[model samples]
Target: SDSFWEVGNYKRTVKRIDDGHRLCNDLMNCIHERARIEKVYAQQLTEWAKRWKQLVEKGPQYGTVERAWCAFMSEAEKVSELHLEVKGSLMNEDFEKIKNWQKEAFHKQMMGGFKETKEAEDGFRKAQKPWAKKLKEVEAAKKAYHAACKEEKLAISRETNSKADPALNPEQLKKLQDKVERSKQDVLKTKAKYEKSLKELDNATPQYMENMEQVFEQCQQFEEKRLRFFREVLLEVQKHLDLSNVASYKNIYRELEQNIKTADAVEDLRWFRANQGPGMSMNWPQFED
Candidate 1:
């Protein structure tokens, strides 16, 4: 009769399941902190984009290079929006899903969230109660049986001594024999009671195993679900941060490169001369009256 309590170490099973709650809390915190970081980073990106855009507008840089420089501000703002979306998904979708899953996995109690664990422990204790009570009865019966046998032996010794003594009266001898008979009967009754209790505990063993195993299996299933869900969570977190999808800024850079490539130095200088430089018509200062 293999006992689940002894063989399975179900206490450790319960402990591990309890530990799962902590892991869930840890994972939620990890995603929440990352979301906060993304939010702050997005804010900084917007600030940087705005500050530089104003500076570039007031600067003297013109033509293709100036257009390319202005592109930076718009693209940076777009990138900031992208990061904000990441933060939203992380906090709203990922964090909320994990919190709900943890709620289902563990039961909430008034003091703390260990109702599942407490119930499991209670079930185990109840299953053991009858068997433990019978065990104590058996021990007590065994001690009584041994004590009765020892009394019987002493009673016989006294009876034999009384028989050998000529000074002992017939009535005293009869009394000693009666005491020996009573002690024998006491041994027989105690031995029978002890064996009966032992049999009851033996009958209880299979039922105990069945009940205990059911509790252990439930915890195992809970842990398996948690593991699978968290695996998907890790993948989801990685997908959110994947930079390959940051195509907004990549296209901006591509167009910026095209503009910078068209920045011919002579063309810019020729335009400057025509517009803002000394007039293309060489007005020598000879005779202006």
Candidate 2:
């Protein structure tokens, strides 16, 4: 009795306990990677919601639009708030326990490019092909030209302000005049660059848009692949419902996460707040004075 009887199947039972976790290790890692991707997509979608709401609220106004703008902003606000909740829900999952399963499974190999989570990156990525290259090139050029224009404009404004001040001395006035002359050169260079970029972008627009449709189809197929994988894998999982709040969590989580724009006045929207963690800090009614 003092030697623990030496034959109660102790070693075998101890090994079996770890063996069970090892069996589910692959599964745990797979779902972990899959859930990670879902989280990122959820993050992007939530940001998209914010942008969409901003555009809707800031769009052109007319008489009928005036009556409807508030109603639309109200709706957009609700939608944005909902998306952030998705973000919030994604953040709150317990991954440490899942990672333990991977460890128990003895995961060791590092594949160069594999796994369900990597599908979005490895295949059907949005930016690919003939027009995408041109599109990226022109957008970069456009941004550079636009920055140059802003600097040139700022210089001219400062020169104008200096000239407006009657208390300015002659040396200061001469310096201001010389600065204006330099600003004119900057303005001309930037204007040419901007126009060139604009023309290039215009030429590329149709091709890019067409290729964009192809890209869209590519992405759709990619998502379909992901969904099928999720179905086959997750359908086997029993506790996922408890883990993820099955059938309604993503929606309800999204709904609860809304930024709740209760300030009423659009001007007062700047004071509206959103949920914490992974969601963006969007100060509404952004204005430049």
Which numbered prediction scores highest in TM-score against the true structure?
1
Model 1, span 1-289: residue lDDT tens: 3545553355776677788999999999999999999999889989998898889888888876677777767777877888898988888888998999988878878997598888777767776676667777878988988899899999998998887788888799889989988998998998898888889878988887677777767777878898999999889888888767767657766876776677677777888889878746765779766
Instruction: Give candidate 2 regions above 4 Å deviation.
Output: 1-150, 153-174, 215-289
Tens digit per residue, CA lDDT, model 2, 171-271: 88788677767767766776677677667767866765565455445445644543464455455443442436544545543543343322235433332
Q: After superposition, how far is residue 49 of candidate 1 from its true place, in Å?
A: 1.6
- Candidate 1 regions with alpha-carbon error over 4 angstroms: 1-19, 104-107, 110-115, 145-192, 245-256, 259-262, 282-289
**What is the TM-score of candidate 2?**
0.29
Q: Which residue pairs collide, candidate 2?
A: 81-258, 81-259, 85-257
lDDT of 1 at 91: 83
**lDDT for model 2:** 0.51
Please give the lDDT score at residue 140 for candidate 1: 91
